[PDB]
Amino acid sequence: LWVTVYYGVPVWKDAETTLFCASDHNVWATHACVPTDPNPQEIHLENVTEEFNMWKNNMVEQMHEDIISLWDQSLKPCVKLTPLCVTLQCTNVTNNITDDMRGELKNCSFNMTTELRDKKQKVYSLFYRLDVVQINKEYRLINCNTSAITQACPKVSFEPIPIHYCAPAGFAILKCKDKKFNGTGPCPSVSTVQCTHGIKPVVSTQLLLNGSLAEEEVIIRSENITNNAKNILVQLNTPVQINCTRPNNNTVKSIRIGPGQAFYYTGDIIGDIRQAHCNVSKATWNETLGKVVKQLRKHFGNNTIIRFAQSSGGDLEVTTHSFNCGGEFFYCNTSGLFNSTWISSNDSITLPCRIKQIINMWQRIGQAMYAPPIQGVIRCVSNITGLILTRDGSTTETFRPGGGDMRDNWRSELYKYKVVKIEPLGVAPTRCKR
């Protein structure tokens, strides 16, 4: 026989390239992305079993890195709190207390700058305790010896907007459509697209909010289920309704710092002072865990006994539910969610929750952002679509909430995608000659 060649042959190879965004005032520069395809197509790939590995997926790495970069571009172009890093003369706010708020709200006076540099303003404001540290009466902001704090830019929205991603021509995105696919391995039912479904950049920990749901049943995905150093990703089939609040009618105040710039300070509270909290339906939560436990039993290989215990790291970013409600940051105590063992009305547990105003995204060093206060009362709702849980090192195993890497929120939603390049050229033996 003879050798002949072909172009446009339907074969491919794994490849890693960049992703192109598509999106449809905000903090993701969504208006800087191409409009999405309102009528995209996907094809069933006939008679192909391919392999996916969500823990080796560069798409995850890229979306994670891109949000970090994007965040800074969105936050960078506005006023700093540098002149605000002064000694604070503080007392407690004891005026309208439920006694659960003791020491939580502080009243401090200080001397800050104004439009004319020779003049100073003696002003006062309110603080939430978590962001203020005693110097010894005399207090300073916690980040005064660590980082510059940028005031968040005032006309922004942090409510996640799903971003769709497209392969460059010559590349394609393979999706796993095989129900109950647990990662790392063969997926017999896949489809191919040029552009995929958008994913919301939800940033939270120990509860995954407003993501995808399992088609039928709770599924556990873990790089190594017996590795005591690993977490597990829990994808729920049933969303859990959660209701969070800041039950205070807030005022806001704005005082000039410099030449056309002002700081937004905390003002005061109308009505009394109350603790933030979150509610879930009780049976729904109990049934949810029964399903999780059933899946863990599958991994154990029997109807073994397990415990759900409390997180213990010395860090709010590790042990609490980290959540952005509107523009304010919740650090909720989740202890009422994981306080049981499993052996083979729906009044909520009203998780108490703390509010922090100055935050440090991604736990990096030398950066900080101040969240301006919001006037009025804040209420928000969400769907818990998954969990990030971990395990301890006997016969009974203990599972706990955990995972400090926001990259895994990306990983969870991206568990079903892989990128390949198309290889249109090939050769074959043939009866044909030139």
């Binding site: 050798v3 002949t4 446009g8 339907p10 192909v48 010559g170 249109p424 050229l425 030139r434």
Partner: protein, 120 residues
Amino acid sequence: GFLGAAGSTMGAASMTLTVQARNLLHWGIKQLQARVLAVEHYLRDQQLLGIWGCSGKLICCTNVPWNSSWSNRNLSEIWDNMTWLQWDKEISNYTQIIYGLLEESQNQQEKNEQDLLALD
């Protein structure tokens, strides 16, 4: 569905080659990298096919014989029961070898044609 052919049923898929080729070709920098990459690959491959004397031609035969070291297969299932994928997985590292031969053959073929016209 430019990749509707899954690599399966390659025989029938040889007529979808036209179709597959139809979609050939801080966010601002990423888009530039993405589009130039599509261009680079397109040109890379068009250049290579062109140097073998084929251009815009999806299927072309040449004057290079097939070697047994490349395939000792049955030759009886290649279209109907062989995937382009599986075959490619079993390329056995002759990609560069074959390509070099294709260029050599064409080099001589062009010369031969020039000499015949020179004879005229």
